[PDB]
Design an enzyme around this catalytic site. Structure first.
Site, PDB file in Angstrom:
ATOM      1  N   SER A 127       0.808  -1.197   0.000  1.00 38.56           N
ATOM      2  CA  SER A 127       0.000   0.000   0.000  1.00 38.56           C
ATOM      3  C   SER A 127       0.844   1.251   0.000  1.00 38.56           C
ATOM      4  O   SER A 127       1.724   1.383   0.774  1.00 38.56           O
ATOM      5  CB  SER A 127      -0.881   0.015   1.214  1.00 38.56           C
ATOM      6  OG  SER A 127      -2.111  -0.542   0.927  1.00 38.56           O
ATOM      7  N   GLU A 167      -5.024   5.667  -2.607  1.00 35.06           N
ATOM      8  CA  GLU A 167      -3.952   4.706  -2.411  1.00 35.06           C
ATOM      9  C   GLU A 167      -3.593   4.038  -3.721  1.00 35.06           C
ATOM     10  O   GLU A 167      -4.476   3.694  -4.508  1.00 35.06           O
ATOM     11  CB  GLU A 167      -4.346   3.637  -1.394  1.00 35.06           C
ATOM     12  CG  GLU A 167      -3.936   3.921   0.037  1.00 35.06           C
ATOM     13  CD  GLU A 167      -4.076   2.693   0.913  1.00 35.06           C
ATOM     14  OE1 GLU A 167      -4.015   1.568   0.371  1.00 35.06           O
ATOM     15  OE2 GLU A 167      -4.253   2.851   2.139  1.00 35.06           O
TER      16      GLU A 167
END
Length: 200
Positions: A127, A167
């Site tokens: 991430s 993200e």
């Protein structure tokens, strides 16, 4: 294609929508499912260095998630970032690398020698954050990733009214070259900077 007045309102909104369009309904839900609880997946991939076969039910979702992440390719090279604690460096340095809001220079030299120029792997899904208007670098370690045009990636919406950004969710088994490490001397603090390039 509608006209993009004011350009992108938050960087990554285009890529997010486009990727979402290509996902099947079951894939989209699996992505949400992963986002809700990522830890069982990522500890599993780390424990076994990306090898599958140990946990059949987990294996099946990992394969589906991998395919979902394949649907969108990066049109252009992008930069993403991660904030991290000194745990990122493992036992030898975590406790030592800092002393009272400042970086240990001699320990940093050793740290730079072990990591800089080398290629490493993240067995779990990675991430990262896409900078829109703010970059949250409160943490001791700030990692910047160059993700090359043509790389695979997914996008997750972490945005709220006051905080949060898009993200970039990198595929598991992402390789990266650690291009550069240095100390950013802030007003009132020091940050360890890692600049890396995703090998595709």
């Amino acid at each position: 294609e509608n006209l993009y007045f004011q350009g992108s309102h938050m960087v990554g909104e285009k890529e997010y929508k486009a990727w979402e369009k290509k996902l099947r309904a079951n894939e989209k839900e699996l992505v949400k499912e992963y986002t809700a609880n990522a830890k069982p997946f990522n500890t599993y991939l780390r424990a076994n260095e990306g090898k599958l076969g140990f946990k059949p039910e987990i294996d099946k979702k990992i394969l589906k998630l991998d395919e979902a992440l394949k649907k969108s390719k990066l049109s252009e090279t992008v930069q993403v970032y991660r904030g991290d604690d000194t745990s990122i460096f493992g036992k030898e340095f975590q406790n030592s690398i800092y002393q009272g809001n400042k970086v240990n220079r001699e320990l940093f030299r050793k740290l730079r020698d072990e990591y800089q120029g080398k290629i490493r792997t993240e067995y779990g899904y990675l991430s990262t954050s896409i900078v829109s208007n703010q970059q949250f670098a409160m943490r001791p370690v700030l990692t910047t990733l160059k993700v090359p045009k043509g790389a695979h990636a997914g996008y997750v919406d972490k945005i709220s009214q006051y905080k949060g950004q898009y993200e970039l969710l990198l595929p598991r088994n992402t390789k990266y070259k650690i291009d550069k490490m240095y100390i950013i001397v802030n007003k009132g603090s020091e940050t360890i900077k890692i600049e890396a390039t995703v090998q595709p």
